[PDB]
Amino acid sequence: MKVWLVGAYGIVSTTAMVGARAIERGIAPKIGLVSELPHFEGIEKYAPFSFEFGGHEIRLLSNAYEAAKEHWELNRHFDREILEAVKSDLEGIVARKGTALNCGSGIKELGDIKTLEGEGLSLAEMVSRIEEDIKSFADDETVVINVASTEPLPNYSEEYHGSLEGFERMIDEDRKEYASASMLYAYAALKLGLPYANFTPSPGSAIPALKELAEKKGVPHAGNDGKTGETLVKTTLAPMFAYRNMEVVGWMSYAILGDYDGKVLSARDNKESKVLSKDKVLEKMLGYSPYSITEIQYFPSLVDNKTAFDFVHFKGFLGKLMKFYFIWDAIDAIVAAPLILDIARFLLFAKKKGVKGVVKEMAFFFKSPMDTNVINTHEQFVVLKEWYSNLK
Amino acid sequence: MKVWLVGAYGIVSTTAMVGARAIERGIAPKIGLVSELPHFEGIEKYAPFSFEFGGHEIRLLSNAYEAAKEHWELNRHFDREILEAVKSDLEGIVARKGTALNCGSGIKELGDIKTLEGEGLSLAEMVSRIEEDIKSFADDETVVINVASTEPLPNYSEEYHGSLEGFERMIDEDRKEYASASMLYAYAALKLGLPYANFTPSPGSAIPALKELAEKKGVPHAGNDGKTGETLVKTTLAPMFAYRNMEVVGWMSYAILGDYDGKVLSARDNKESKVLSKDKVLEKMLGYSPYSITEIQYFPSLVDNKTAFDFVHFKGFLGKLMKFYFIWDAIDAIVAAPLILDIARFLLFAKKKGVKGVVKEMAFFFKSPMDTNVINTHEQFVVLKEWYSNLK
Amino acid sequence: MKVWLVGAYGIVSTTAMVGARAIERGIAPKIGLVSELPHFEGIEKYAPFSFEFGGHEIRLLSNAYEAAKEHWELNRHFDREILEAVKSDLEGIVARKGTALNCGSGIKELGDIKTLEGEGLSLAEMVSRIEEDIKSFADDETVVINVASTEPLPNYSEEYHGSLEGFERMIDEDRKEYASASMLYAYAALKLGLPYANFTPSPGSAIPALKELAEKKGVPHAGNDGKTGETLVKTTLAPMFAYRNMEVVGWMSYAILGDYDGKVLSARDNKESKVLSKDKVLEKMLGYSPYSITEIQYFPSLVDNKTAFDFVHFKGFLGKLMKFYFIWDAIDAIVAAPLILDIARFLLFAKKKGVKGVVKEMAFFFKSPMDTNVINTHEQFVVLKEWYSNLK
Amino acid sequence: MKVWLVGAYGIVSTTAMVGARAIERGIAPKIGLVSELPHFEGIEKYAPFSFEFGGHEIRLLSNAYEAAKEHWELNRHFDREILEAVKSDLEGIVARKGTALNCGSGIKELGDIKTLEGEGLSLAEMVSRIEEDIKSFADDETVVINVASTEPLPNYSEEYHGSLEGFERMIDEDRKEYASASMLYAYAALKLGLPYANFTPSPGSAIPALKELAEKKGVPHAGNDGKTGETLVKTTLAPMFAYRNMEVVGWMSYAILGDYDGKVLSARDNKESKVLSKDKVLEKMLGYSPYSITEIQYFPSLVDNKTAFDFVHFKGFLGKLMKFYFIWDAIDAIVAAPLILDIARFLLFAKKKGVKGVVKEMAFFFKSPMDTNVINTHEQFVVLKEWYSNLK
Numbered sequence A, B, C, D: 001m002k003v004w005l006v007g008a009y010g011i012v013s014t015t016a017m018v019g020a021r022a023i024e025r026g027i028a029p030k031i032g033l034v035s036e037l038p039h040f041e042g043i044e045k046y047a048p049f050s051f052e053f054g055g056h057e058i059r060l061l062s063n064a065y066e067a068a069k070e071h072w073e074l075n076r077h078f079d080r081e082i083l084e085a086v087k088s089d090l091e092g093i094v095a096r097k098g099t100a101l102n103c104g105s106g107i108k109e110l111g112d113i114k115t116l117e118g119e120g121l122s123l124a125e126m127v128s129r130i131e132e133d134i135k136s137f138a139d140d141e142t143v144v145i146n147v148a149s150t151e152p153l154p155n156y157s158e159e160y161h162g163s164l165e166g167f168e169r170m171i172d173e174d175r176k177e178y179a180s181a182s183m184l185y186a187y188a189a190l191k192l193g194l195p196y197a198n199f200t201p202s203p204g205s206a207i208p209a210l211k212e213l214a215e216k217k218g219v220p221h222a223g224n225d226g227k228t229g230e231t232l233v234k235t236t237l238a239p240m241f242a243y244r245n246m247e248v249v250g251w252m253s254y255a256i257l258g259d260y261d262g263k264v265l266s267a268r269d270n271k272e273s274k275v276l277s278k279d280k281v282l283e284k285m286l287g288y289s290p291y292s293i294t295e296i297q298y299f300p301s302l303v304d305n306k307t308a309f310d311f312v313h314f315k316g317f318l319g320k321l322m323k324f325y326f327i328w329d330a331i332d333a334i335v336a337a338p339l340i341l342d343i344a345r346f347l348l349f350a351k352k353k354g355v356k357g358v359v360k361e362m363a364f365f366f367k368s369p370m371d372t373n374v375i376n377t378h379e380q381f382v383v384l385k386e387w388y389s390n391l392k
C-alpha cells in the first residue's frame, strides 16, 4: 500500500519509514504494531504489511535517508545496523515541496525552508500543486497522514471554515490569512478520495468544512494528536481511581524534551495546545475534575527522549490523602512510528469496508479523538477490537 | 447486617469497623467504597450500609477499641475525633479466642497470645468452639471474612484437602499437622452456611475440600488476597503494554513496610506467599511471562505506610528499550478497609440472589482470584458490574 | 533572647514559636537545629535556648495561637498535643500592625489585611511607627528576622537604593514608589541598631543603602532566602559531579505546593523571585552553567507540603549521557522553622562578638547568601564552623 | 605508563582501555577523569596521561578487542566509531592466563574458563607464573589494578593472613584452601615492587600479611572497591542530614543490574561482599546507626546499566517525618572506567613521591577505603586534594 506523509522528513515519519522497510526486509521484529496483534489477524487480507512512501516537506533535505540519518545522529533511537540496511530504500524516497502557510513564529527553527507560497503562488495554485503531487503518487491503496510540526491555534473563521462551500471560496479568493497548511493538505487528501489521518494537534480535517467534504466524498478519516506517552499512561490509569471510588484531588504532569518540537512548544504562545489537553481528559474518565496541571518544557540534552513526571494526589477511605508518582522515559518517535503504520492499515481497512467520515473507533491512537467521549484507554481498545471485529 | 472478622484486632479489621461506624454516625465521607459507586445503586435493598461486628483473635486485648487505638497511635491514619466518637461502639466489640494452628514461626512477633490449640484441645473441639462462637453471632445476614496474618504454605495432603470426606476425617483424627487456622475458620463458616471471604493469601477456603463444602451447602464464597495498592497499579498498568503490542522485558516490584505484617512476611517463612504471585499474574495479562522480581522488606519507621517501587523495562518499535517508574505511597489499612465492607455487602447480595460456590465475578478485589483467569483491572471491573446487573 | 518576626502570623513563623515553646517546656526533642550541633557547644554562653516573640503582621487574627491553629488545621504538621500545650504562651503573643507596601498582586491572595499605609500615613511616620513598635519590645538581646510573603522585584532606583543618603531622602520626601515593606522593616531593625536577618527572596537589607547603614551602625546581618529543601539537595549534590569531572548537560527542578505561599507565588510577577537563581547557583559550584530550569507551581491539595522533582542529565567517560532523579517530600515550615531560631542565636552571637555588616559566614542558611561565592553545602558548613570556632 | 589489569577482558577494564586509546588518539574528551581536574595541574610531570595495557584473565578470548567488542555489542556504552578507531590498539593486547582460586560458585557463570590450577599446579608455581607474566611486562612505571569478579568471603586463617611469614608459608606449603586469586595477584605485585590497587570488594592486599609486605618493600597501595554510583550519591548526600541536625530513621538502597556481576551477586553466597558494608557507612557520616537495608538483585535486561532506588526517611523539627527519594541510572563501566586510569595515575605519583603502604588519602575512589574512617565524599575529596598538595 501507499503512504503519503505530511512532514515526511521528521523523526516520527522517517522512523516509521525506516521501520516499515526493516520489517519488510525481515531484519526487525513486528513489536510495537497494534495491527499485528492476534486480534487483528485477518487485516493483512485488506491491507498487507507493505509500504511505499512519499510525502510533503518544507525542509531542504535531499531524501528520506539523509533525513533519517540526521535524526539518528542525534538520538541513536535504533541500531546503526538497521539504518545502513535501509539506506537504499529510504534514499529513493524524495519529498515534494510543501506549504507552511500560517505555521507561526517557530518555523524559523527548522533551519532552511522552501515553500509553495515562497514561489509566489495563489492559494488555488498551491492547493493545485499539493493535489497533483499526491495524485501522481496515489493508487487505490493510498492513505494520507499528517505528522508535521504542530501549528498554532488557527485564525478561526465561521465563513471559511464553517462549510465546504466557504472553504473553497477561501482557496479561489486566494485568502491565505485564513488557511493553515494542515487544512490544505487534508482538503487535498479528502478531495482526491484518499483516507486521511491527523497525528498532530493541528486543525487538519477537524474543521466542519473538511468533515462535510469527508462525508460527501465517502472518505474515512481519523484523529487527532497521537496518544503515545505520558497521556497513554494517564488515560490507562486514571480509571483505576474511578473503579476504586477514590477521589483524585490533584494531578500533575510535567514533561521535558529537546529537539525541533519542544524548542517550539516552549513559548506559551504555541505552548497552549497541550495545557487544555490533559484534564478535561480526566473529567471524562472520573466524572469530576481534579486540580490539574499540564506542562511541557524545553530541555535540549534530552532531544527526542521526552521525559515526564506525574504526581497523583488522591483521597481514600475516611478521606485520607495518599500519593502516587510515576516517571515515563521513552523516545517519542519509537512510540509514535508504529501507530502511523497501524493507522494507515486500519484506515485502508475502513476504506475497503466502505466506512465514511470520522472513524470514531480509532480513538485509541489519539488524545483529542474526534467525535467521541471515550477516553479511558481500556474502553478505547475494546472499542477498536469491536469495530474491527464487526466489519471484518 | 453482620460481619464476623477473623483477625479482628488487626489494623485492616479495626479501620474497617472505625469507618463503618463513622460513616453510619454521619461523621466521615463514603470515599473508597466500591459498593457505593453509581452503577451499584439499589444494592441497599439487599445489603444496606449497616454493620455489626464480632470476630476471632489470638491477641490479648480487651476490645476492638483498644486494638483500634493501638494501631492509631503508631499510625495516625485517621483523625483523633473519629477515634473518640466511635469509642463506645468499638468498646462493645469483643473478639473470641481463635487458633494459630500452623501459622508460622513469626507468630512470636504479635507477642501475647492465647489460642484454642493452646488449651490442649483437639481439632474436633477447636472446630466446635469456632463454630459455636460464630453460630452465637450469626443471622441470615452475617458474612465471615478473613483478615488474619498470612499463613505459610500449608503442609500438602491430597487425602485431607482433596475432598470434604478427607477434611472431615482430618478433623475427626486430630491430624493437626495437615490443618491450618485459615482452613478451620473457613470450614466453620461454611458448615454454618454463612458466606465466606478470604482477604489474605492463606489457603482459607480455596482448598478443594472446602469448595466442595460450599457447593454442597449452597453458600457463596470469594478470595483470595485483597488487591489494595501496588498490585492494583500493576493489573491496571500492565495491560497498556499489551494493548500497544509492547514487550515487557522486566518488571520489578520492591515494597518496604513496618508494622506487624512487616517483620514476619520479610524473612523466609511467610515471604514465599507473595513472590509466586506476580509473573503468573503478568502472564495472565501480557500473555507471556517476563523477568519479574517481586519483593517486600521490613522497614520499621514506615509502619502501616507501605511504599512500593516499580520499574518496568519494555521494548517497543524496532526493539528499542524504554523505562517506566512508579512509587506508591499509601497507608495500607486505608486502601484495604473499605474493600472489607464492600466484600461483605456483595457477598450478602450474592447469597440473597442464590449464588453458591466461588463468586468468580468478585476478582476485582483480589490478587489471587479463585476460578478466574481474568486479572486485567478493567476486565475485572466490567465483570463485577455485569454480574451485578445480571442478578440485580 | 527576644526575637521580632516580620510576617509573625505565617506558618513558618508560628511553627518556630510553637517549637521554641515546645522545646522550652520539655515536650519536644531538639532535632532540626544547626545551633544545637556539638561543634556549637559553648553557644548558650551568649545565645541560650530561651525565646520571647513579637512581630509585625497585616492579617487580622487575635494572637499567634489562632495564627498557629489555623495553619495546623490545614497542615497537621505536629501533634494536637503540642499545639495545646503552648496555647497559653502563644496567646500572649500579639502581632502589631505593619506595612504591605509594594508587595505584589498576591497581597490580594492573603484574605483580609489592615496596613500602616492603609491609615494613609507617610513613609516617615510609617517608619517611626515600625521603630517604636520594635523599640518597646527590644532589649539588648533582641534580633529581627523577616519571614513575610515574597515581594516582587523592587522598583529599580539607584538614587534611592544606592546609598543611605538616598534612602533617607526617599523616606523624607515620602516617595513610596521606591519603597517596599521589606526595606522599611530592615531600615528599622538597623536604625534601632539590632541584628537583622532576611529569610526571604525580598530585598530587605540587601539594597546597597542598607548594607551601608549596617556597616556605619556596626550591626551584623544575614540573608537572603532560606535554603530549606530542594535547594539544599541541589547545593549538596551538584558538587559530586564536579568532584568526578562529569559534565552536567542539564538540570530540572519542578516544585509544587499550595497554602498561602503557593497562592502568592502562583502569580507570574511574584514568581520571578525564583527563576534567575539556580543557574548562577550551579555555575558557582560547577564553574560552567548547564541548561537549568527551576519552577514552582500552585497545587492546592499539597498545602504546605512542598514536593519537588529534580532531574540531572550528565556526561561521563567517553561522553556517555546518564540520568539522576530525585523526589523531595517535606513540610516546608518544619524545615524552615528551626533555622529561624538557629539564625537568631547566631546573629545574637555575632553581635556579642562585635561582628558588623553582612555575616557572609551564615551562607549555610540561604539560597542567595549575601557577599559570598560559597554555595557548596559542605563548604558552607565548614565556613560556619570555622567562623564560629574563630570567634569562640 | 604501563597498567596490568586483573580481569582484563572485563567491561570495566576494556572500557578503560577503549577510553584511554580514544583520548590519546585525541578522538574523545577527558570527561570523568578526576586526575584531569584543575587542582592536580602538574600530575603529569610524574604521570602523563599515557597508557600501555597487559593483564590476567581466565576467559578465552583472542585479545582485548574481541573482549571490548563483545561487551559493546551487549551494552552500546560508547560509540561504534570509537571501537573501530581503537581496534588495532586493543588487538595487540593479549591477556596472560591467571587463577580462579576460591572465587566460588560465581565462576561457573563466566563461560569457557581456563586457569593456572587447571593445569594441576601448586601455589608455589602459580605465583611464580603470575610474577613472571607481570615482571616481563613491567617497567619502572607500571601499576597493577584489580578489576576481577568479586570473590566470596575468604576462608579464615589467622596464621596465613596475619603475617608475611604466615602467608608465604601458605604458599610454600600449597595451602590452596586458604588463598584466593585476589590475594595471589596482590602478593605478586608487591613482591615485584609495583604499586597495587583493588577496585573490587575482594580482600586482595587488605589482609595484614599483604600490607606488611607493601611497607616492607616501600610500595604504595590503594583500595578497596570502587565507589561508582549509588554509594557515591549516598556518601555525598547523607552528610546533609548531619549538617542540618536531622535524624535518618531508615535508609533503603535497592539496586538492579544484569550482565556478569549481576549474575554473580545474585547467588546469595557472593552477594555478601556488600551486606555489612552500608550501616557502618552511614554511621561514619551521621554519628548514629539508623535502620538501613542495602540490596542488589539480578535483572537480565539491564545488562551493565545498574539502576538504583533509594528512599531516605528522616525526622526534623518537632520529630516530624519526611521523605526523600532518588533514582540513579548509569552505566557502571562508564562511571568506573575513568577511575581505573585515575587510580593508576595517582599511584605512580605516589610511588614517585616515596609514598609507601596503604595510601588512605585515596579513599575518594572507594566504598571500603582501607585505613581510614573518612566516608563523606566532600571530606574525602578535600583529603585527596590536600594530600596531593602536600607532596606536589
Ligand SMILES: NC(=O)c1ccc[n+]([C@@H]2O[C@H](COP(=O)([O-])OP(=O)(O)OC[C@H]3O[C@@H](n4cnc5c(N)ncnc54)[C@H](O)[C@@H]3O)[C@@H](O)[C@H]2O)c1
Residues within 6 Å of the ligand: A006, A007, A008, A009, A010, A011, A012, A013, A056, A057, A058, A059, A098, A099, A100, A101, A103, A110, A147, A148, A149, A150, A181, A182, A199, A200, A201, A202, A225, A226, A227, A228, A229, A259, A260, A261, A332, A333, A335, A336
Ligand atoms: N510521539 C510523538 O512524537 C508524538 C505524539 C503525539 C503527536 N505528535 C505530533 O506529531 C508530530 C511529529 O513530528 P516529529 O516528532 O517527527 O518532530 P520533527 O521535528 O522531527 O517533525 C516535524 C516535521 O514536519 C515538517 N513540517 C512542518 N511544517 C510543515 C508543513 N507545513 N508542510 C510540510 N512539512 C512540514 C518539519 O520540517 C519537520 O520535518 C509532532 O510535531 C506532533 O504534532 C508526536
Ligand SMILES: NC(=O)c1ccc[n+]([C@@H]2O[C@H](COP(=O)([O-])OP(=O)(O)OC[C@H]3O[C@@H](n4cnc5c(N)ncnc54)[C@H](O)[C@@H]3O)[C@@H](O)[C@H]2O)c1
Residues within 6 Å of the ligand: B006, B007, B008, B009, B010, B011, B012, B013, B056, B057, B058, B059, B098, B099, B100, B101, B103, B110, B147, B148, B149, B150, B181, B182, B199, B200, B201, B202, B225, B226, B227, B228, B229, B260, B261, B332, B333, B335, B336
Ligand atoms: N493492604 C492490606 O492491608 C492487605 C492486602 C491484602 C491482604 N491483606 C491481609 O490482611 C492481613 C492482616 O493485615 P493487617 O493490615 O490488619 O495487619 P495486622 O498484623 O495488624 O493484623 C492481623 C491481625 O490478626 C491477628 N491474627 C493472626 N493470626 C490469627 C489467627 N490465626 N486467628 C485470628 N486472628 C489472627 C493478629 O493478632 C493481628 O491482630 C494480612 O495477613 C494479609 O494477608 C492485607
Ligand SMILES: NC(=O)c1ccc[n+]([C@@H]2O[C@H](COP(=O)([O-])OP(=O)(O)OC[C@H]3O[C@@H](n4cnc5c(N)ncnc54)[C@H](O)[C@@H]3O)[C@@H](O)[C@H]2O)c1
Residues within 6 Å of the ligand: C006, C007, C008, C009, C010, C011, C012, C013, C056, C057, C058, C059, C098, C099, C100, C101, C103, C110, C147, C148, C149, C150, C181, C182, C199, C200, C201, C225, C226, C227, C228, C229, C260, C261, C332, C333, C335, C336
Ligand atoms: N522553608 C520555607 O517555607 C521557606 C524557604 C525559603 C524562603 N521562605 C520565605 O518565607 C516566607 C514565609 O513562609 P510561610 O511558609 O510562613 O508562608 P505564609 O504565607 O504563611 O507567611 C507569610 C506571612 O507574612 C505576612 N506578611 C506578608 N506581608 C507582610 C508585610 N509586608 N509585613 C508584615 N507581614 C507580612 C502574611 O500575613 C503571612 O501571614 C515565604 O513566602 C518565602 O518568601 C520560606
Ligand SMILES: NC(=O)c1ccc[n+]([C@@H]2O[C@H](COP(=O)([O-])OP(=O)(O)OC[C@H]3O[C@@H](n4cnc5c(N)ncnc54)[C@H](O)[C@@H]3O)[C@@H](O)[C@H]2O)c1
Residues within 6 Å of the ligand: D006, D007, D008, D009, D010, D011, D012, D013, D056, D057, D058, D059, D098, D099, D100, D101, D103, D110, D147, D148, D149, D150, D181, D182, D199, D200, D201, D202, D225, D226, D227, D228, D260, D261, D331, D332, D333, D335, D336
Ligand atoms: N561500576 C562498576 O562496574 C564497579 C564498581 C564497584 C566494584 N566493581 C568491581 O569491578 C569488578 C569488575 O566489574 P565488571 O562489571 O567489569 O565485571 P566483568 O565480569 O565484565 O569483569 C570481570 C572480569 O574479570 C575476569 N576474572 C574473574 N576472576 C578472575 C581472576 N581471578 N583472575 C583474572 N581475571 C578474572 C572475568 O573473566 C571478567 O571478564 C566487579 O566484579 C566488582 O568487584 C565494579
Ligand SMILES: [K+]
Residues within 6 Å of the ligand: A011, A012, A304, A332, A333, A336
Ligand atoms: K517525536
Ligand SMILES: [K+]
Residues within 6 Å of the ligand: B011, B012, B261, B304, B332, B333
Ligand atoms: K497491613
Ligand SMILES: [K+]
Residues within 6 Å of the ligand: A329, B323, C323, D329
Ligand atoms: K531512566
